[PDB]
Every structure is written in C-alpha cells, then in structure tokens.
Amino acid sequence: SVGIVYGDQYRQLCCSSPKFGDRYALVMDLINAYKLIPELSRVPPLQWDSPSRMYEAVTAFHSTEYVDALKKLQMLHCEEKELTADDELLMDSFSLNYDCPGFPSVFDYSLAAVQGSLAAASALICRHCEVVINWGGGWHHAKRSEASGFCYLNDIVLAIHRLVSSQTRVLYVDLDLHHGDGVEEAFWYSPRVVTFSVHHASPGFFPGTGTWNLPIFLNGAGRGRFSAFNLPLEEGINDLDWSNAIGPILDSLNIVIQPSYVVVQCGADCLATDPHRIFRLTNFYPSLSGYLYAIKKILSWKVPTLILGGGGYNFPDTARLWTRVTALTIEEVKGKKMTISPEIPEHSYFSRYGPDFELDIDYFPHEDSIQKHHRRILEQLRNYADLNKLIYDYDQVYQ
Numbered sequence: 001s002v003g004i005v006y007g008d009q010y011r012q013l014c015c016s017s018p019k020f021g022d023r024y025a026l027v028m029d030l031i032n033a034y035k036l037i038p039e040l041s042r043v044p045p046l047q048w049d050s051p052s053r054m055y056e057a058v059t060a061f062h063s064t065e066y067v068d069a070l071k072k073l074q075m076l077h078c079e080e081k082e083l084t085a086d087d088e089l090l091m092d093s094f095s096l097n098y099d100c101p102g103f104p105s106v107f108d109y110s111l112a113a114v115q116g117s118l119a120a121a122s123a124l125i126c127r128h129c130e131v132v133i134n135w136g137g138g139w140h141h142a143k144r145s146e147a148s149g150f151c152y153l154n155d156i157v158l159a160i161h162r163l164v165s166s167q168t169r170v171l172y173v174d175l176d177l178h179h180g181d182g183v184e185e186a187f188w189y190s191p192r193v194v195t196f197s198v199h200h201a202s203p204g205f206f207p208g209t210g211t212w213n214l215p216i217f218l219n220g221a222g223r224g225r226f227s228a229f230n231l232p233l234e235e236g237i238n239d240l241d242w243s244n245a246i247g248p249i250l251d252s253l254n255i256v257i258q259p260s261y262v263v264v265q266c267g268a269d270c271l272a273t274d275p276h277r278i279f280r281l282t283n284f285y286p287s288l289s290g291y292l293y294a295i296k297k298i299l300s301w302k303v304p305t306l307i308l309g310g311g312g313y314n315f316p317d318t319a320r321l322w323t324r325v326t327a328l329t330i331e332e333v334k335g336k337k338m339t340i341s342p343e344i345p346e347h348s349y350f351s352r353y354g355p356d357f358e359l360d361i362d363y364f365p366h367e368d369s370i371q372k373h374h375r376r377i378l379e380q381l382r383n384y385a386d387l388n389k390l391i392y393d394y395d396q397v398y399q
C-alpha cells in the first residue's frame, strides 16, 4: 500500500510551532478534501515504552547532552519566569537561539517528527507499504549537538539509520531550496548512504555549504569518500531546466548504486510563489512541475521509498504541491488513476485558497555550467564505484 503518517495528537503537535503555524493541517485537509485519504494506509507515529527507549532512539544520532538541553528548554518555556544567565549560556552552546528559539512545545514538536519518520521507515522494512509519506517530517539541517534553520531533531538521519540497520544501501535525494547539510554530515564517512542535494547556493545564502569550497567540491571522507553529491544552481531556474539538470543524475545514481531504499526530502520552497522568490518551479501537471518530474522518475524505479516534507513558507501553495505529489504516488504505485479537479473543493480551509481557489499555483512562467557540473558529477560517480568496487556499464550511464 501507500502509507501516510497522521494522527490527532500528531497533527496537534505539528501545528504548535510559531514558525510553521497550521501548515500541516492545511496540507492534510487538502489531501482529505480531494478524497485521497481512503486510498492511503494510515501509519501511526512511533511511541516508546519508557524514557530510556526514547533516549536510546534519539541518541542514535544526537548527543545526550543536546537532548537534555532541548527538553530543559521546553520546561523553561512552560514557566513564566525568564532564563538565567547560566541557562542562556547553556542554550547558546547548542545554537538553541535566534533562528531556533524555544517555545512551550519545542521538544514534543521536534520529537513528533522523529516518531513519524521512524514509523514510516518501519512500515517499509516490514513491507506493509511500498512507499510512505510523512509531510510532518524532513528537518534536514539539525546536527548531532546543534539546532539549525528551525530544525531541532534530524528525523531524516534517524529514519535512514533505521533503514540501513535492517548489504543495505540507501539513496537520499534532497529537493529543498536549501542544501541538506545535516544529513550529508551525518553520513560523511559512510559509503552505504549516498546523499544527493540540489539547491540554491550563493555568497551569504543559508546554510552556506553544498558548493565550491582553485576551490573544489568536498564529497565525503574515509570509506565515504565520493559518497556525498551536490548540484548548486543559480537563482531563477524554471521547471524544464531544473528537470534536465537533475534527471540524468538521478538515473545514473540509481543504476550505479542500486539502492535498497530511497529517501526523498521534498521541501516546497523552490516554488515560484514561495516568499524566498529564488527558484521558479511550479506544481503544474499538464510545463511540468520539476517536483512531479523527479518524484515520478524515482517511483518508476520500484524501490521502497520514503517521501518527506521540509521547507515551504507559502502554506496554501505548499498544500497544493504536496497534494499533487500524494496523488501521483498513488497512481504510480497502485496503477489507479487519480483525477484531481482544477478547482479547490469545499472544506474547512477553503477560504485560505483565495482569491481564485484553483489547484495550480498562481504563476505565469517564462525563460553549460550545468554541463560542467554533469561532467564533474559523473567523474565522482566513477570514483565512487571504483572505490567501492561496484559493477556497472559506463556506456549505459554515459548515455
């Protein structure tokens, strides 16, 4: 079946942060208004049988002291009195500040996404589901002992760790506007988790990595050398050029790596209507949405797949994209056509889709360095396959 993570408590927690507000509710209610929920298997978030089992799961990646600080940060924000100087210094040492502030549910909110993405991995491992979707997950910037970019716990790293410990190889594909630095870093020394991020990069733009470092690309270390891939792209790119840029790379990686699982981060901040206003992708499904192109290509491999959310700050347009991604996944896996009306159906958040209440985002598209990146990346894939002694047809890949 196609699984999707949700639950009443889960929806409550995913909607409790100051930055992302009720985004997750809009996403799931649009999926519901288009009658997709009966097509999907509900995957409940993982719960644990003691505080010690919870800690053992989260500290598979994160340090115990970081977990301790994040839980203390929640407690402190549930009392009225403000922080002492010693507690502020403690939070500062884990970057629990500025872009990653505390709030009354910050720990349960962060943990919830971990619970969802670990349950999604389990449902793929036991073969209940061929694909699982978690639009509450995808928080790719969090590091072992540091919050970053409103990511407090790295649900993706923990999901991938569960997958690889079930020889298992995982291909991680990161479609967010931003470089997936936290996932890349976690698996920097690990050849069995190959990471590939396509993103904007330019001087001063967050988080800064995934690009030239004459400078060269770093790409892993130890036995993980050549196992971290990156494609940085200039601002203004449209669906067609983004699709051609990443399409051959995706197919080459699948052919050479032959992954046991694929994990996709599908942050929606590349949409032309995101307030970042950097890339110009759409949710269009005839100009074909770069996101839908990539997901369809990945699903055509027939490899068990985890699809996660991520960035996306125009909440109705994020709903519009992820609803179409969800219908596409049903069609590709079940072989059953999903027809989606071009008009938004009546439902509790209908008023949020004004002023025109259509499923297409409201955008009118327009519009050699990529050739050089393609040559560089193919060379790296050759180095990866040589180092790891893999068998593959150069002429099929070079094709």
Ligand SMILES: O=C(NO)c1ccc(Cl)c(NC(=O)c2ccc(Cl)cc2Cl)c1
Binding pocket: 099, 141, 149, 150, 176, 178, 206, 267, 269, 275, 276, 310, 311, 312, 313
């Ligand atoms: O999504 C992210 N990473 O995956 C991510 C990480 C760090 C930052 Cl600073 C941001 N940026 C924002 O939050 C933001 C920027 C401009 C505007 Cl107009 C509105 C917002 Cl909401 C996003």
Ligand SMILES: [K+]
Binding pocket: 174, 175, 176, 177, 178, 179, 180, 197, 198, 199
């Ligand atoms: K990315």
Ligand SMILES: [K+]
Binding pocket: 187, 188, 189, 190, 191, 192, 193, 194, 195, 220, 224, 227, 228
């Ligand atoms: K790696």
Ligand SMILES: [Zn+2]
Binding pocket: 176, 177, 178, 267, 269, 310, 311, 312
């Ligand atoms: Zn982002």
